[PDB]
Amino acid sequence: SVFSERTEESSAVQYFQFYGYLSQQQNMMQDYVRTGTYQRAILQNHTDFKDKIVLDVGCGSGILSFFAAQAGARKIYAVEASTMAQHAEVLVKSNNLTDRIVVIPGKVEEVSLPEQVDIIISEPMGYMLFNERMLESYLHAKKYLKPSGNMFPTIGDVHLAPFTDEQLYMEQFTKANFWYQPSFHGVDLSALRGAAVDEYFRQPVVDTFDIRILMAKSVKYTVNFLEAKEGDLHRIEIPFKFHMLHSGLVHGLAFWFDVAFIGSIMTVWLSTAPTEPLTHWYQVRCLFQSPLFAKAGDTLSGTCLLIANKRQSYDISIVAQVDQTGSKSSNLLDLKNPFFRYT
Amino acid sequence: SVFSERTEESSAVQYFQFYGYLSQQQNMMQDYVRTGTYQRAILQNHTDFKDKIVLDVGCGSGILSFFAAQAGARKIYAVEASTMAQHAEVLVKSNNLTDRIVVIPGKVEEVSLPEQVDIIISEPMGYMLFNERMLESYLHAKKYLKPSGNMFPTIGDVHLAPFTDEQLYMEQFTKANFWYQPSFHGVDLSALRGAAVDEYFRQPVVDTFDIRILMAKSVKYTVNFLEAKEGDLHRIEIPFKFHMLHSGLVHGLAFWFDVAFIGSIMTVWLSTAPTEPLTHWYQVRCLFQSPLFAKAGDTLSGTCLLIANKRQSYDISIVAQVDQTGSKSSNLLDLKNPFFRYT
Amino acid sequence: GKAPRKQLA
Amino acid sequence: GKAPRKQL
Ligand SMILES: Nc1ncnc2c1ncn2[C@@H]1O[C@H](C[C@@H](N)CC[C@H](N)C(=O)O)[C@@H](O)[C@H]1O
Ligand SMILES: Nc1ncnc2c1ncn2[C@@H]1O[C@H](C[C@@H](N)CC[C@H](N)C(=O)O)[C@@H](O)[C@H]1O
16 A cells, blocks of 8 residues: 555554554643644534535544534544544444444555545644654545545644754753763773764754744745645755844754644634644754854755655754855754653 | 564564663663672672673673673673664773673574673563563573573562552543543543553553552562573463551552672672662552552452563563452553653 | 654643 | 663
C-alpha cells in the first residue's frame, strides 16, 4: 500500500501501539484547546455536516465522529488503524449511534469505503505540524472525497522565527562537559566531548517559551489541504528572510503552527503559537551549534529543509546567514528524537 | 543465534539504539552508587583481576573494563552490541590501553572470542532486576568462562513486600476514571471504564518511597549467576507468604533488588533497597486494581509469576489473598511499559 | 518516534 | 522497553 511503501514495518508497529493506549487518546482528548476547538468548528458550521456523509481519518476514540454526529451528519465513516478501533466501536454502540457512525479498522490507505464523502475531518498534526507524516494520510484520503467536498481542517500554516536564548544554548555544553573530565573514576573521558555535543544539537527541543525570545516576526509556510498532494510533503523547502527586530545572538529557529477550518458559516482557527494558551504540541526549537550575531535592521536569510524519512518523520536541515555580514550557520536535526524539555 | 530466537528483531534494534546514545551511557555512569560500587567491587578484589583474562558483557562506554584494567588484568574483551562500541574504542585509544582492552563489537551470543576467560563482569540489571532480559545474555556468556572462573556480579536478590499508599492508588484510579465520564463533550465514555482500569493498572510504578509504607518483611528470590542457566529466567515463579505487621489496605507489592560481588578478598553488595541511597533503578511497585484489606497478624499469600516475552521483558502476574478472609486480587502487569512517576 | 504525542498538564 | 533505564 502507499502507507507500507513509505514506512518501515517496525516504525508503524510502534506508532499504532502508542495510539492503541487509552491513556494516549486521553492525553489528546484532554487538550481542551484542541478538542474544544474541533467541536466548535464542526458545530458552528452545522450546514457543512447536517445530513452529510463524513470520513474521519484516524478516528481514535471516535471523538471527532461524535462531534460530526452532534452536528447532524447522516453517515460518518470512522477509520482507525490502531487497536483503539475496537474501543471506538464499543463507544458507538454504547452511545446508540450504530446507524450513523461506522468504525472501519485499518489504515486509510488500505481500507474500502462503501461511498464517497462530502467532507473529511481529521486531527493528523504532529509537533512541528509534520511529525508522524500523518498529513500524507489525510491528503491520501481525498480519493474518497466528492468533487467540491471539504476538509476540516482546510489549511495548515507553519510558523518559523529566530530566537535568542543564551541559557538554552549554553546548557548543551554544560551537559556535554560531563565528558570533559581527565579522571572520571580514573578514566579520561575527554575524547567523547565533541560527539556528546553533536548528539545534543541533533535534538529539536519541545517545550514552551516566553515570546520575548523571538527576534523577528515569523514567516509562514502554508499547506492547502484541498489542493496539496501527498508527494508535496516528501521534501519541504521553507525559504526565509527575517527582518531582525532586535539585536543579539541568534541561537536557532522556533516553530509552531495553526490550522483553519474554513466552513460555510465561519472560519475557525486552532493555533499552537506561544501567544496562545498551551497545547500538548507546545512549540519546537531547533538550535544552531554556532550562533549568529545580528542587529535590528539586518536580514537573516536561509532555508529550512525537511526531508521525509521511513520512520514517519523528517531529517531537518537548517542553513542561515546574516546577509550584511555573511556570517553563516548550518544544522542537522532528527525530528523523531526530540528533547522533551518541559517541566 | 540464541539471541534472535529469543528476541523480536525489532526489539533488539530499538534496545541497542537506546544504549547507542552518549546521554544514556552518561545517565548510568553518573549514578555514583552504581559506578563507585562496581569500582570498589573490582578494585578491592584485585586478585580476581591481576593478570587475568576478563569478559565485559555489554561494555557500553567501557567503564567496567577500565576498572578491570586498573586492577591489573592482562586482557579484557569488551563486548558491546550497540554503536557505543565505537566510542568505547576511542576511549581505549585516548587512554592508551589498546594493549589490554579489546572492543569486540556484536552481541555476546554471536561473536567469537580468542580464548576462555577467568572472569565475567557485567551490568545487566534492569528495573526489578529482570527487565531487558540482559541477564540471559550474561548467563549465556558462561560458554566463555573457565572452570571455577568467576561472575561479577555473582548473585542477585529480588525482594518483594506489600505496601499501602492510597495517594498513589488514587492518582492512578483518577486517571482511569476519566473513562467513567458519561458526558465528555457530550459523549458517554463509561463503557470503557473497565478497559481503562486494566490498562493503567498494567503499568508498574517506578519511583522511590519511604519504608514506612511497607507492611511486612520482604520475601527474597535469589538467582545464582554462577549456577543458573539462561532458560531458568524464561519462567520465574515467586511464591510468597507475608506475615502482616500492620493493619490497613494493601495497595500492591513493592520490589527492589540487590547484587553481590563475591570476590576472593571480600564480598561487596550493590543494593537498590528503599533503605539505601537512591539509584537510577529507583524501586518498582505493582498496584492491585482493588486493594486488599488486612489485619496485623494476617498472612498474605500467593504467587508472582514472570513470563519472559519477545520484547525483551516479562508479563507479570500477581495473585494474592488474605488467608483469613479469602479476599483475593489477581493482576497482570506489563513490565516493559512502566509509569516513571519520580518528581 | 517513541512518544509522537507529548503529555500535557 | 521503550526507555529501559530512565534518568537519575
Ligand atoms: N494511515 C492511518 N490510517 C488510519 N488511522 C491512522 C493512520 N495514521 C494515524 N492514524 C490514527 O489517527 C489518530 C490520530 C490522532 N491524532 C487523533 C485521534 C482522534 N481523532 C482525536 O482527534 O482525538 C491516531 O489514533 C492514529 O492511530
Ligand atoms: N546481548 C548483548 N551483547 C552485547 N552487548 C549488550 C547485549 N545486551 C545488552 N548489551 C549492552 O550492555 C549494556 C548494558 C549497560 N547497562 C551497561 C553499560 C556499561 N557496562 C556500564 O556499566 O556503564 C548496554 O550498553 C547494551 O547495549
